[PDB]
């Protein structure tokens, strides 16, 4: 074969002819760098035995192992293929052991399919028998999307592999990793996935979460597809320039979904329709969050809070890290250093702010009659810990408080215990949201305080290239035992089960409210429950650059509320870096400045009351808050439809191949282009301006650039923000908290396209009740402008905000002078508004107007 198509037969060691021969593979060392010297032969694997059988849902096939050397042990002789034409755009196939039940992910959202093959498929499936392969092609153009024929199917108990050709190199996704770029390097790269507490740095290791989804943009027409593997065992994904991708996992089953869409966004919508769309956040979670590890005392925390409030920083949320606890134990506070914590909570609340508390899964096991630790006693009484391999002894590890046991969040009763612990603590400290951390789960000892037994779970025949090369490193023994199964199988599901339990707890502690959950470890579908942050980064320019692809990727995974620690967790942050990162950070969907222990303060007001950093931070945060109605509506669409929030340029501009690798800029939704300075010393940025009309956000002037690379001038106080022609942006006068800003006058920004038309929408509900979308208690309105006329149209009208909200300002960009501006209500005029016009900038602002939110209006003008 073409060397780019070789599928490596020796993933586990340096390639030798002797091993190649024993494995029945092909040997050819004469390739280029990273081209496998030993690769699978053309007929190695499985063949279809007999006929495929039609089922109501699709078909099944029996696959029989063609005689083969047992490399990673216990091979599976009879494999069952079950294929289901689940929807017109989603294909599901699974390969199981015909004769034995194997571990399958007990996902909380995904259900087994019952019912019949879908009509009007956008795809076709083709099965080859001798040797087995499966191919999924797009019906419209016969483009081959998934094609396993490039390599073997391998299916041993602890080694399962399938490959697929890909129709392009525009591949985005997989996680959790620092990829450094957004479009994948298809040049022989292997990405291990196994939830792990480690530093998101340049080493390309497995990190906190496990995300097997990827999306492929087929060509400039926008046609795209995506693939998801429902498997929670350690795995790695191998990318090569064929182009092709190989999944290699060490247990469970190969359970694949293939999704087709007409655009990249439609693929994401299809993926999220399957795994679970993201929670609609509390509107307050959209504001700016502040945090650090080790304020040390409530006095220190209060001083930080107070200087940022004194500076009028938009600032909704304060996080309290493990320093609030009594000796780093959950569900206590330090009665000396945090004496008066409940009074401080009241102060936060009186100022319109929210408290988010960190909670760790591990529970101190140090409790006596003399000094009881309630959470451990109650947990032991309920028998809800993760056990050792004997199945009866709670496993002992070590985390922040010292020796600890670990809750088994897969046990339904564990959620009852967890809920009661939060109820009890909420009675003392009235926190508003929960930050779940260390939930990979992270262990300061490897496996347990007594290590791990040598066995096939702790020491498997094949180990993907995870950091440190052992599964149990900085986590639990793989033979530890939980309600859903052994840690070997469910390790990647710990943070997911914990988020599910935590949301369950919120039902009791925050009745009928969304609250906020922020989680470190994630699995596919975690976004239904929680926000995410990109973990323990560093105050470097590299970390700032690497943040954007990480944010875009999590939006693909349906965790749109995601961001890094702005300014950098580890290390003292330089002023210039923190200023640039604050500017960018004002536009991360989850915007939090957080800092590690002992490092110099990096909260915005710490740089000085009159500093450039503070001024610019406040400035761009005030822009974020102004655009919160737009951001919120983008979250409404992510929740209800499955759209991304932070979005790659290529999701909107896929026709333009110059956007396919852009990862130094991004969009909010379709209409706002963010262009940060990402280089030390720079007052410029080399940026791409897509094929659209664009307007400078602050001045409203139309840029001359279109569909081209530019050097954008961005001095130390600026970040690029441009509005897309053809879009209408709802705004609301900002205040330093969202409690307050939500009572303010609204505005519209109408950015006219080349045809002097534009469209937009606004979702509005109470900002905090759970299920307002499912129960249809909300306002959705639509704005459109087509020559001389803005129409405000109400499509859903079941919530009326009691604060008398109205649009009191309309700003029109790219317009000739309007004249004779008329306002009609339900067709009835209806008042002559005030119009200000800038003939140099071609901007009109209409004021002295009061268009009540929830009412239909026409605003008309002449030229
Ligand atoms: C607070 C943090 O502590 C732990 O991580 C720290 C490591 O223990 C240190 O070894 C050091 O890591 C360095 C690596 O060893 C080195 O290989 C290189 O990559 O640089 C690293 C530093 O950049 O520093 C680590 C912290 O930077 C622990 O493993 C980690 O999970 C902890 N972070 C969480 C805990 C808290 C405190 O409640 C929160 O504040 C954080 O946001 C959590 O993410
Ligand atoms: C971990 O071990 C404990 C025992 O230490 C198991 O607790 C059992 O729980 C069931 C259901 O709650 C009770 O009916 C039994 O009486 C408990 N056994 C004992 C010996 O008390 C628990 O099931 C274990 N967890 C897992 C995942 O196996
Ligand atoms: C990679 O990891 C090592 C620890 O093994 C660390 O010291 C180093 O800084 C990392 N390198 C990069 C490029 O991030
Ligand atoms: C902003 O909120 C404060 C409460 O902190 C309130 O006093 C004030 O009236 C609000 N002002 C605005 C922006 O209209």
PDB file of C-alpha atoms in Angstrom, residues 50 113 126 128 146 156 203 348 414-415 465 506 512 690-691 751 770 774 819 850:
ATOM      1  CA  UNK A  50     -23.252 -16.294   6.270  1.00  0.00           C
ATOM      2  CA  UNK A 113     -33.001   2.232  20.325  1.00  0.00           C
ATOM      3  CA  UNK A 126     -22.076  -0.978   2.707  1.00  0.00           C
ATOM      4  CA  UNK A 128     -17.801  -6.131   2.710  1.00  0.00           C
ATOM      5  CA  UNK A 146     -16.497   6.196   7.222  1.00  0.00           C
ATOM      6  CA  UNK A 156      -9.526  -8.988  22.061  1.00  0.00           C
ATOM      7  CA  UNK A 203       3.433  17.743  25.999  1.00  0.00           C
ATOM      8  CA  UNK A 348     -21.968  39.061  48.654  1.00  0.00           C
ATOM      9  CA  UNK A 414     -24.565   7.927  46.971  1.00  0.00           C
ATOM     10  CA  UNK A 415     -26.547  10.787  45.447  1.00  0.00           C
ATOM     11  CA  UNK A 465       0.487   6.267  25.800  1.00  0.00           C
ATOM     12  CA  UNK A 506     -29.175  20.799  43.302  1.00  0.00           C
ATOM     13  CA  UNK A 512     -36.466  24.802  40.859  1.00  0.00           C
ATOM     14  CA  UNK A 690     -13.906  36.606   6.544  1.00  0.00           C
ATOM     15  CA  UNK A 691     -16.155  37.171   3.488  1.00  0.00           C
ATOM     16  CA  UNK A 751     -25.328  45.640  11.350  1.00  0.00           C
ATOM     17  CA  UNK A 770     -35.006  25.167  35.791  1.00  0.00           C
ATOM     18  CA  UNK A 774     -39.162  22.614  28.382  1.00  0.00           C
ATOM     19  CA  UNK A 819     -35.441  60.401   7.708  1.00  0.00           C
ATOM     20  CA  UNK A 850     -39.644  52.736  24.149  1.00  0.00           C
TER      21      UNK A 850
END
